Write a protein that binds this ligand. Structure first.
Ligand SMILES: [Cl-]
Ligand SMILES: [Mg+2]
Ligand SMILES: [Mg+2]
Ligand SMILES: [Mg+2]
Lengths: 204, 241, 4, 231, 222, 196, 250, 243, 244, 195, 4
């Protein structure tokens, strides 16, 4: 009866030296029952990455929606949408459903391909933008993620260091939440290569 | 030639209905004129009561649109009153929506846009009127803005309208040529009214009694029209001159 | 939803 | 001529030709007569048939217990207008517990017809009506034309050759106006009036139609053997 | 939140703290609660974060269009009227609590707007969970005829009361100064009295610490 | 709130306290509850601040439009426009409004519009939470055709008492004087009215 | 009452011309000359302020309009039609772009929207086409400087330089001689001022010429400071005085 | 040409020929008048007796609006009824919102704007009536005449229909011979005379006279019809004068 | 009323033709020629610009060739403004299909809906038809490479090679002559340019009066790439086949 | 309604669905087929609110059959599943949402792979080796976590299913009156008649 | 909400 914690799951994002990382768990459940171990919560539209936590049906719907909107954007503008811009489009789209919202906690990460700047942001279900230098967190284990990140994080990490840090924040937060976990994926994003790593984690 | 009955283009790229609407502008055979003082804006127009049976007080082509805006019409009265009622509604709405009094020039633009629509959308005819708006704007000072059936509008130093308009226009241009300024360099609106009546007399080559004219004055924070008596007082002072 |  | 394309167009002499052509279908209509005393009001109508195998088109329609009418012209248009009248009489009862004044019935029909003479796409009604009734101020006869003009009369007639009856009634006025408390005498006068408009035909038993309303008679309609009494 | 507005001699100044909360949790340590409606009309907003941003942009957009249409610089009372009538229509469900201030051809102005749509005029105002801490300071130190520098101090002092004494407020002070005849100056992080101390230890991990199952290169290209 | 309007020899006076509340917190201690809907037609507002402002703005707008088309509206007409709003939206409105104006024909007039949107024309009217405490006083001390100074005193003394007992009233006492001579704003501070 | 004109007023003739579009272009032909030139670091758009009476104050009538802080427009044809198009163009930049993406539309896309509006006046029921051609000069981060012409049909094209209205044929020829891909903005202003003298009869000064640029960001025109990523409008109207300064070195 | 086949089209002189044709329908109708007086207004009209069969007194043509306004018209009768129906709605809604009964100038513009509206589109036809109307409000008496174009003004006296010229001349005399004002009961008699005089121009059929009035003193500012001894008395005063 | 001024855009002639469709087609016949040719390993779109001025910005320009999605493009002959209205509709329709089925829209399905829109303007609503004919070039995994055309009637048909706009009679004859089924893309590129070269109303075909696109499997393995040629790329392909 | 399962093996998808229909304290029917064929290689089982289930299933079936006729082509299981999900995702915010859960089992002939989709009434879609709706999953998921192998034959699949039905008949509170089993593979859809 |  609280739509934001029927299915469970989490997303975290971090900035480093000329890179960003964004990670999620793989659980999809119906309350106590784990149902799927392969439910990824991160999507990309060109070089802009979007993670979505919350009600899975809305997660799926919103991915389908932003694919649609960015495809048309590309056709009309003749370029890939940038993270600063995509962030604004996410905000508009959620607030448009102000009094009947999507029960989601989206997170945007990527590198602006003109300015080279790393960029992350997070949103509430009705579109409020939270831009941050350091990290954004989302999902049923968000308290834990806030704790892990605020203590583990330091500015200007190299991509392979940032990888360890974001992975340890995710894993240890997931393990203190009954509704998150069951696998995990980490995206390391540099100006033009993106590595995707699946983490080994406890399956309970 | 059905391009002559509705507002679509003719082969030479013209709108006959708009052009004919301009011709209805003079149907009444009145001339109006407006000038700016330092502190005020004056608009005068001829008042012709043919029939002896008319109540002369109900015969007017000057309208108080808002506390601060007055408007004189050249054209038939039904179209004139239609335009005034709309202007009154638009000026009241603007005040309510935005929390300050509608400026003369913005009202002029708005009424011009409304007219433009009648030149483009077929089911509406243009109004056979030219609207001269006057005020002492709180930002821009004394103001005169004028609208026609084409949807054209612009601000004036001074202006005139009607069948014998060109006489009055050149009369005024000749004054400003000489005076070298934008307006009537006069303290009191009483004397600016006097100037206005005086130069209308020269340009038209006719004399006026108190019941031949109709005068509206705009000062900071009110627009008002004069009685027969305030005009008589004004005609008297021009004579002792 | 975040408050201020 | 160039000005008869629709009702929304005036001619250069200020006429409305579609309204005038509507008036014309009334003229082709079978004759009908109205007349009244102070105690009753009577309608007589000549019914027309298609051929000898056909029925004789009804021309009289009951509107309420105290009101009803006769038609000349387009019959479906009488059905529309009589149905409107039924509703208006009805509304007056349910809401105010008040029998609708025949005069108001008049004004209501005029205003209904008029709308169809000022707007594009509609068309004027193509029927004339004679309305009789008995109300709080006595017996009444009205004449309705689809120009929207309604008129209160002691007597009248409409349709083809109605001018015969309308003349007869004009001389007879001082007599029939004072046939009080005698239903059958008022009807006789009505039947005679209509006879001034016959040509090559006379009133048969399935040809004549009469209606009466008044002080203590609900509006009722007589056809067939019930009219033999009067031939 | 804590937010304030204080009139001075030639204008008006507004200020806000920079904390965002999700229940007891600090969602954002440095968000901007000062919004530009037009170049010389600024807004501080408390309440539902998305609502204050959205309502502020919408009216900012319409004010721009209006300014273009009228060939005039926008007035504060227009922002005021548009905001209040919008909020009233929504019967309180749009949770925006705003201090609106600016300079325009008419002078300098200071207003507040509550979410049900009522407006207030004053020389000093405060709104938000920190509004009582701030108002205690304003009622204590405000005077008629403040200079610009006195007004700035007074405002940020009022925000500081909120930061220290209200759990709904923290981190930094943002200010905006709108003086007659001059450009608005927006002073983002005017005060930063809550700098995190140096951590005791670095938690950077030995590389290889995290167990990986699979890698793969992601295709971002065409 | 505490509000009232009183007719006298030369016209009418409106008075009000300056307190707005948000529970027991005073959100504004210098509120102006006396509001102009036309040059010489004003109202006193009580109830919801948002409702009463929204209403007064609409009424001001109607009367501005009335003025443009038909000249100066009567006080009765202004009260009718308030009523129409309050009555037709009675489910969604918390507005207790007193309307007061000056004609040259009609002199001073007061119309009070309580919660349900009924209208009542009276010599004087009191309203707002603080009014309960001064029914006794006001009924005992009001007379018709008082002078300006007597009427200022009556209002000052009455609202003084309402403010004293009602926690939802306070600050300054504002008044608005409405005569043939124009429009006059008065203000009286606590140190004066408190110790009356 | 109401609009019973729900059918098109522009239809194909048997030769395949759309009469009303052709006639609208004829109205544009009659119109006063306007032009635009694209430099390497700017665009200039210019036209003659041909006054109706000398009692008129023609600064109150702006023929060159700001659409966004980086986009400007000018026209030839019917003034009132242009006025309402600017109103509609300004608004659609917000409703269908800025309110969605939090930034102003790029030139081609705003142009695209104006074109859509003009196309609809060519096919919708009960209306005539717009009697104007626009030139829209603009800048955006990923396309740089650009210049577009929009016609009554709704068609638009990108130009290095062009002219429209009365003396357009002559002026287009003049511009082919002078235009190269190395023009610095000051050179384009100069060429625009020369090209415009050919087609102006009467007085030729900074009170009868309206002229605007899309060039460098103008922080001094922003109205506020403290957001270092907001740098100011690239659109600037040249003053009466600025024009006269460039006419003495003509 | 063809400019005259479609309402709301300007001809090249600047005219709306369909309105002008509506005026012909007005000129074709029976005569009606109004006389403004000291503290009120009087309305009169000629009713042509088409036949013996018309019930006398019982086809009333003057119409009341609200409680204080009288309307009379010449031309297409149903068009006039339609106009008065709208007038009644306009007065009802004014009184509803503003409490006071509608002032006469205010009422005049309501009809004016509505009539003028029917000259803006080709999908409606102009009104085939000229209407004389007026009454008493807080500012005194007002008389008005309104034409198919929407044009209206205030009048000392006014006439329309077939006898409009005859009647106009007659009115002009009264205005000159009574410059300090005409009393309500004087005006009632004069009105009877003038309708009898203007019946000259319509004289195949004889007619029935109908009068009404509002006077601050004689009817308390309410619109009433003139009947019985007062009507007969004003008929007699008219009869005197045509002999 | 307003019936007086109604052209009745959606009626039949006594011969049972649709006047406005016929007249729209007549309009299209003066438009820059566009050609589509389908190979076994790709598709070519080539089109001639309506006669240039030297001052036209030719590289940041598009008048003839539009991208519908990643697998489908169109070539336009007729009113550009009319065509954009339809192009955005088609682009949106593609995205609705993708959103609904998580599969790219089959080419015919897209073509059918656009043609169905056109058909409507000829049967109801009293509006003028769209003065546009399209050549659709696209790929899908049911039919592979496909060419279609639609015209103002909303009729559509599929082709191995086709032209629209001006001089389609001459162009169709020439394509018929030299087209053969086993053809590669690079042969079809040549055929397209040679055909325009001979049908052009201009003196000689230059880079600056053309638009050009291919749709090949010529990316990497079992997937498809749209290439809209830059001016310099056309100038080269014009040399490479010896037309300049 | 109540029990619906699905297992995907090497070369097919098997759907098992309970036969009972119960209202109040009466089992009204013991031979109910809780399934609709959407296309020749796609099958959908359903469970949920009375009335809603069949109305929804038949409505999807009507839409898919229309598409088939229109394009003379069979939509892939992935495509059908996405269509179904969207319908449910719209529904969840309607005035009265469809309270229906489904399993979609199909053989994709382009890929030559069997596919099983589990979709709940909110429009939550997941592709799975094995699936269940309602309380059934609480016994079968763990059992299948143990006994299931990716490369099983259709016969191995049916034995695995016998295990699931046995467990459910041992531990479930209700008598669901057995299951109807159906196999979807390269040759279409068939029903096992003795289970 | 603010009361009076
Ligand atoms: Cl308040
Ligand atoms: Mg866990
Ligand atoms: Mg028109
Ligand atoms: Mg107190």
């Amino acid at each position: 009866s609280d739509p934001s914690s029927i299915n469970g799951g989490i997303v975290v994002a971090m900035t480093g030296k000329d890179c960003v990382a964004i990670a999620c768990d793989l659980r999809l459940g119906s309350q106590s029952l784990g149902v799927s171990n392969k439910f990824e919560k991160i999507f990309h539209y060109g070089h802009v990455f979007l993670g979505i936590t919350g009600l899975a049906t809305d997660v799926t719907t919103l991915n389908e929606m932003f694919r649609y909107k960015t495809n048309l954007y590309k056709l009309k503008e003749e370029r890939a949408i940038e993270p600063e811009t995509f962030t604004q489009l996410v905000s508009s789209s959620l607030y448009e459903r102000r009094f009947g919202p999507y029960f989601v906690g989206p997170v945007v990460a990527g590198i602006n391909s003109k300015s080279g700047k790393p960029f992350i942001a997070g949103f509430d279900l009705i579109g409020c933008i939270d831009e941050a230098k350091d990290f954004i967190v989302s999902g049923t284990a968000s308290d834990q993620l806030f704790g892990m990140c605020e203590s583990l994080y330091e500015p200007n990490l190299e991509p392979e260091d940032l990888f360890e840090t974001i992975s340890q924040a995710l894993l240890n937060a997931a393990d203190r939440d009954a509704l998150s976990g069951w696998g995990a994926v980490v995206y390391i994003i540099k100006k033009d290569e993106v590595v995707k790593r699946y983490l080994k984690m406890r399956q309970d | 030639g059905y391009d002559r009955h509705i507002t679509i283009f003719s082969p030479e790229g013209r709108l006959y209905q708009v052009e004919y609407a301009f011709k209805a502008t003079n149907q009444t055979n009145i001339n109006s004129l407006a000038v700016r003082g330092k502190d005020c804006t004056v608009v005068i127009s001829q008042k012709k009561v043919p029939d002896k049976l008319l109540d002369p007080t109900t015969v007017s082509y000057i309208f108080c649109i808002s506390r601060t805006i007055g408007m004189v019409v050249n054209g038939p009265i039904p179209d004139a009153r239609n335009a005034a009622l709309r202007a009154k509604a638009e000026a009241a709405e603007f005040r309510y929506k935005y929390g300050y009094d509608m400026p003369c020039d913005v009202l002029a633009k708005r009424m011009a846009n409304l007219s433009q629509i009648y030149t483009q959308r077929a089911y509406m005819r243009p109004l056979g009127v030219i609207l001269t708006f006057v005020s002492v704007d709180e930002e821009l000072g004394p103001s005169i803005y004028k609208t026609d059936p084409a949807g054209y509008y612009v601000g004036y130093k001074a202006t005139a309208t009607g069948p014998k308009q060109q006489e009055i226009t050149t009369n005024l241009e000749n004054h400003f040529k000489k005076s070298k300024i934008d307006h009537i360099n006069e303290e009191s609106w009483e004397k600016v009214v006097e100037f206005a009546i005086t130069h209308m007399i020269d340009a038209l080559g006719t004399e006026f009694s108190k019941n031949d004219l109709e005068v509206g004055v705009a000062t900071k924070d009110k627009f008002f029209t004069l009685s027969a008596e305030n005009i008589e007082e004004r005609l008297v002072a021009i004579a002792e001159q | 939803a975040x408050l201020x | 001529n160039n000005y008869d394309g629709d009702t929304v167009t005036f001619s250069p002499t200020g006429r409305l030709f579609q309204v005038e052509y509507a008036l014309e279908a009334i003229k082709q209509g079978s004759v009908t007569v109205g007349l009244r005393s102070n105690t009753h009001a009577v309608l007589v109508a000549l019914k027309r048939n298609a051929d000898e195998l056909s029925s004789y088109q009804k021309k009289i329609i009951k509107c309420d217990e105290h009101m009803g009418l006769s038609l000349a012209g387009l019959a479906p248009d009488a059905r529309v207008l009589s149905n409107y009248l039924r509703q208006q009489c009805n509304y007056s009862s349910l809401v105010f517990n008040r029998k609708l004044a025949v005069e108001r019935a008049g004004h209501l029909l005029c205003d209904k017809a008029q709308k169809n003479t000022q707007s594009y796409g509609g068309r004027p009604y193509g029927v004339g009506l004679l309305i009789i009734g008995y109300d709080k101020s006595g017996a009444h006869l009205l004449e309705f034309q689809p120009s929207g003009n309604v008129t209160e009369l002691y007597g009248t007639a409409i349709g083809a050759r109605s001018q015969g009856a309308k003349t007869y009634l004009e001389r007879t006025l001082d007599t029939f106006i004072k046939i009080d408390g005698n239903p059958d005498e008022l009807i006789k006068a009505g039947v005679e009036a209509i006879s001034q408009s016959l040509r090559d035909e006379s009133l048969t038993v399935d040809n004549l139609s009469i209606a009466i309303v008044g002080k203590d008679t609900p509006f009722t309609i007589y056809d067939g053997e019930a009219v033999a009494k009067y031939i | 939140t804590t937010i304030v507005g204080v009139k001075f001699n030639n204008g008006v100044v507004i200020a806000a703290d920079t904390r965002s909360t999700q229940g007891p949790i600090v969602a954002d340590k440095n968000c901007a609660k000062l919004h530009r409606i037009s170049p010389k009309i600024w807004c501080a907003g408390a309440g539902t974060a998305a609502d204050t941003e959205a309502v502020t942009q919408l009216i900012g957009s319409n004010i721009e269009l209006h300014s273009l249409y009228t060939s005039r610089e926008p007035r504060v009372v227009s922002a005021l009227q548009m905001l209040k009538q919008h909020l009233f229509k929504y019967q309180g469900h749009i949770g925006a609590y705003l201090i609106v201030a600016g300079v325009d051809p008419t002078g300098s102005h200071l207003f507040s707007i509550h979410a049900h749509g009522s407006t207030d005029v004053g020389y000093y105002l405060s709104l938000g969970s920190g509004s009582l801490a701030a108002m205690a300071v304003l009622e204590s130190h405000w005077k008629q005829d403040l200079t610009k520098e006195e007004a700035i101090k007074l405002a940020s002092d009022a925000i500081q009361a909120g930061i220290w004494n209200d759990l709904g407020s923290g981190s930094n002070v943002d200010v905006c100064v709108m003086e007659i005849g001059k450009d608005a100056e927006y002073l983002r992080n005017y005060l930063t009295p809550n700098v995190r101390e140096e951590k005791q230890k670095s938690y950077k991990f030995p590389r290889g610490t995290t167990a990986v199952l699979k890698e793969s290169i992601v295709n971002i290209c065409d | 709130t505490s509000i009232m309007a009183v007719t006298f020899k030369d016209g009418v006076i409106l008075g009000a306290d300056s307190r707005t509340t948000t529970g027991a917190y005073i959100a504004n201690r210098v509120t102006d509850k006396l509001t102009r809907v036309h040059d010489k037609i004003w109202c006193c507002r009580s109830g919801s601040a948002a409702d009463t402002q929204a209403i007064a703005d609409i009424v001001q707008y109607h009367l501005e439009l009335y003025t443009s088309q038909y000249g100066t509206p009567s006080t009765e007409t202004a009260a009718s426009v308030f009523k129409e709003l309050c009555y037709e939206n009675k489910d969604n409105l918390t507005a207790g409004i007193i309307v007061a104006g000056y004609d040259d024909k009609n002199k001073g007039e007061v119309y009070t519009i309580p919660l349900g949107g009924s209208v009542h024309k009276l010599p004087y009217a009191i309203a707002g939470s603080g009014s309960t405490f001064i029914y006794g006083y006001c009924d005992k001390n009001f007379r018709e055709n008082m002078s300006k100074e007597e009427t200022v005193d009556f209002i000052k003394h009455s609202l003084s008492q309402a403010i004293k007992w009602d926690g939802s009233s306070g600050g300054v006492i504002r008044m608005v004087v409405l005569t043939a001579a124009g429009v006059e704003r008065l203000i009286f501070y606590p140190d004066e009215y408190e110790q009356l | 009452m109401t609009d019973r004109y729900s059918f098109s007023l522009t239809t194909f003739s048997p030769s395949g011309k759309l009469g009303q579009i052709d006639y609208a272009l004829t109205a544009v032909k009659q119109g006063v000359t306007s032009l635009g030139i694209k430099a390497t670091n700017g665009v200039v758009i210019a036209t003659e302020k041909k006054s109706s009476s000398p009692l008129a104050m023609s600064e109150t009538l702006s023929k060159v309009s700001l659409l966004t802080p980086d986009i400007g427009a000018v026209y030839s044809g019917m003034g009132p039609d242009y006025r309402v198009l600017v109103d509609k163009s300004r608004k659609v930049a917000h409703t269908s772009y800025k309110r969605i993406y939090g930034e102003y539309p790029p030139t081609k896309l705003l142009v695209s929207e104006v074109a859509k509006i003009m196309q609809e006046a060519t096919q919708s029921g009960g209306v005539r086409p717009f009697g104007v051609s626009l030139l829209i000069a603009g800048h955006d981060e990923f396309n740089g400087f650009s210049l577009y012409q929009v016609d009554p049909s709704g068609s638009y094209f990108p130009w290095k330089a062009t002219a429209i209205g009365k003396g357009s044929v002559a002026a287009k020829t003049f511009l082919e001689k002078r235009w190269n891909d190395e023009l610095e903005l000051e050179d384009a202003i100069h060429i625009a001022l020369l090209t415009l003298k050919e087609s102006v009869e009467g007085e030729f000064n900074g009170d009868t010429i309206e002229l605007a640029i899309i060039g460098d960001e103008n922080p001094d025109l922003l109205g506020y400071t403290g957001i270092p990523t907001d740098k100011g409008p690239r659109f600037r109207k040249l003053t009466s005085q600025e024009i006269n300064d460039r006419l003495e070195a003509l | 040409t063809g400019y005259d086949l479609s309402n709301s089209v300007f001809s090249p002189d600047g005219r709306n020929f369909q309105v002008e044709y509506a005026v012909k329908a007005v000129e074709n109708g029976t005569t009606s008048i109004g006389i403004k007086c000291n503290d009120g207004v009087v309305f009169a009209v000629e009713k042509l007796i088409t036949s013996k069969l018309l019930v006398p007194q019982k086809n009333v043509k003057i119409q009341v609006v609200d409680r204080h306004i009288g309307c009379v018209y010449s031309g297409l009768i149903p068009d006039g009824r339609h106009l008065v129906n709208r007038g009644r709605e306009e007065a009802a809604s004014f009184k509803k919102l503003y409490k006071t009964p509608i002032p006469i100038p205010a009422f005049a513009d309501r009809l004016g704007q509505y009539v003028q509206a029917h000259t803006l589109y080709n999908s409606v036809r102009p009104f085939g009536v000229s209407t004389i109307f007026g009454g008493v409000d807080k500012n005194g008496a007002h008389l008005y005449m309104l034409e198919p174009s929407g044009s209206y003004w205030g009048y000392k006296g006014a006439a329309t229909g077939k006898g409009r010229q005859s009647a106009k001349a007659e009115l002009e005399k009264l205005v000159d011979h009574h410059p300090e004002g005409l009393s309500a009961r004087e005006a009632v008699k004069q009105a009877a005379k003038i309708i009898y005089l203007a019946h000259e121009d319509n004289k195949e059929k004889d007619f029935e006279l109908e009068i009404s009035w509002c006077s601050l003193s004689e009817t308390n500012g309410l619109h009433k019809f003139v009947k019985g001894d007062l009507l007969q008395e004003a008929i007699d005063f008219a009869q005197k004068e045509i002999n | 009323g307003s019936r007086r001024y109604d052209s009745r855009t959606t009626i039949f002639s006594p011969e049972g033709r649709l006047y406005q469709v016929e007249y729209a087609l007549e309009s299209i016949s003066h438009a820059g020629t566009a050609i589509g040719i389908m190979a076994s390993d790709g598709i070519v779109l080539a089109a001639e610009r309506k006669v240039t001025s030297t001052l036209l910005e030719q590289d940041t320009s598009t008048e003839k060739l539009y991208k519908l999605n990643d697998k489908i493009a169109v070539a336009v002959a007729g009113l550009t403004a009319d065509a954009e209205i339809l192009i955005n509709t088609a682009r949106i329709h593609a995205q609705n299909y993708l959103k609904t089925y998580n599969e790219d829209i089959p080419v015919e399905i897209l073509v059918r809906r656009l043609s169905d829109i056109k058909q409507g303007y000829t049967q109801h609503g009293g509006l003028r038809p769209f003065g546009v004919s399209f050549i659709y070039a696209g790929y899908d995994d049911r039919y592979g490479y496909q060419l279609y055309t639609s015209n103002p009637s909303g009729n559509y048909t599929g082709w191995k090679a086709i032209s629209v706009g001006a001089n389609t009679s001459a162009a169709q004859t020439l394509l018929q002559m030299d087209y053969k089924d086993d053809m590669k893309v690079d042969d079809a590129i040549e055929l397209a340019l040679k055909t325009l070269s001979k049908t052009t109303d201009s003196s000689a075909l230059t880079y600056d009066r053309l638009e050009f696109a291919t749709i090949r499997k010529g990316a990497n393995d079992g997937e498809v790439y749209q290439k809209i040629f830059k001016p310099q790329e056309i100038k080269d392909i014009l040399v490479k086949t010896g037309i300049t | 309604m109540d029990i619906i399962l699905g297992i995907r093996v090497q070369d097919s998808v098997i759907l098992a669905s309970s036969k009972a229909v119960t209202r109040g304290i009466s089992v009204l029917k013991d031979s109910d087929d809780k399934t609709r064929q959407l296309s020749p290689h796609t099958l959908m089982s359903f469970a949920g609110e009375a009335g809603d289930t069949v109305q929804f299933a038949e409505y999807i079936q009507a839409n898919i059959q229309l598409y088939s006729i229109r394009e003379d082509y069979e939509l892939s299981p992935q495509a059908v599943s996405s269509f179904v999900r969207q319908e449910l995702a719209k529904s969840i915010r309607s005035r009265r949402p469809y309270q229906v859960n489904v399993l979609i089992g199909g053989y994709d002939k382009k890929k030559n792979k069997p596919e099983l989709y589990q979709i709940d009434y909110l429009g939550t879609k997941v592709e799975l080796p094995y699936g269940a709706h309602g309380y059934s999953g609480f016994y079968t998921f763990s059992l299948l976590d143990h006994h299931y192998r990716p490369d099983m034959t259709t016969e191995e699949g049916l034995d695995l299913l016998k295990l699931c039905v046995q467990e459910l008949e041992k531990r479930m509170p209700m008598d669901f009156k057995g299951v109807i089993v159906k196999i979807v593979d390269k040759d279409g859809i068939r029903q096992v008649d003795d289970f």
